[PDB]
Design a protein around this ligand. Sequence first.
Ligand SMILES: O=C(NC1CCNCC1)c1n[nH]cc1NC(=O)c1c(Cl)cccc1Cl
Length: 285
Amino acid sequence: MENFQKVEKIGEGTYGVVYKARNKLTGEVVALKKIRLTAIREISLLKELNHPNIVKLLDVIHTENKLYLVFEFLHQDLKKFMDASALTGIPLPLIKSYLFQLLQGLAFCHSHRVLHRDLKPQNLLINTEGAIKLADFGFGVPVRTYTHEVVTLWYRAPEILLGCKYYSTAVDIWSLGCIFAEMVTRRALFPGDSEIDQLFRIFRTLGTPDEVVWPGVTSMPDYKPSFPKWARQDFSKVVPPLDEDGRSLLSQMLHYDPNKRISAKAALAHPFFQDVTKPVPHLRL
Ligand SMILES: O=C(NC1CCNCC1)c1n[nH]cc1NC(=O)c1c(Cl)cccc1Cl
């Protein structure tokens, strides 16, 4: 750890602080995550999970009660680029390129039985090259200072909210669907501020789920017959001015039933991507 010089604190999460740092010996600039203290073996698997759309875990440094993760550094995250692009919006061909790349990254994860579990714009890092990468794949002492982030539950799949313990790769598809919608419309799709507010915002848009559209729903841990019964609203009202290929794909990423939800791999074959390209964003570092 003496091999690293802090440049600045980048931010803090629930169980770790992130710094920009310089490797005194490689010359590399890196993002360093510090966690105050199975975990070690699952991190070592993370070291082998290498893909162009996954932030490269360069090193894991266990010292006798801290764990440091050393990542490749990227300058910008999607959350801030969305904020930066709010007045004009992200051009569609860039939206589609970022969506395709995250689908590639997830296709890869998923085929190796790795779930992200917590995708959100602030976890998606971007470079000058038009690349977008998955970061902060989903123990330790809690940072007392961590300040609460409104966006926290906004990307949570409904089966998580309903108490499914043994949820699947489909939760990452749901999250990415929510991100897709938000890029298109420049508004969060389901901006809940508690778990029941998050559930009810979903129900209001997509309709309260029942056995017809989601077999087994009524038997989930936190499901209540007393949930209000909202009617589903038209998708054309939900993400204008997205074209029918886009809306068709989004609809399949947002299926209630985890088993009907489109997989990352099938999503890459969707007609929305027939004309995909790789534009480069205009970033202001
Ligand atoms: O945070 C980073 N860069 C900042 C983006 C916003 N502008 C300044 C630079 C970064 N660069 N490489 C990796 C990361 N961050 C993460 O991997 C990460 C962790 Cl370790 C924990 C929670 C979220 C994220 Cl994204």
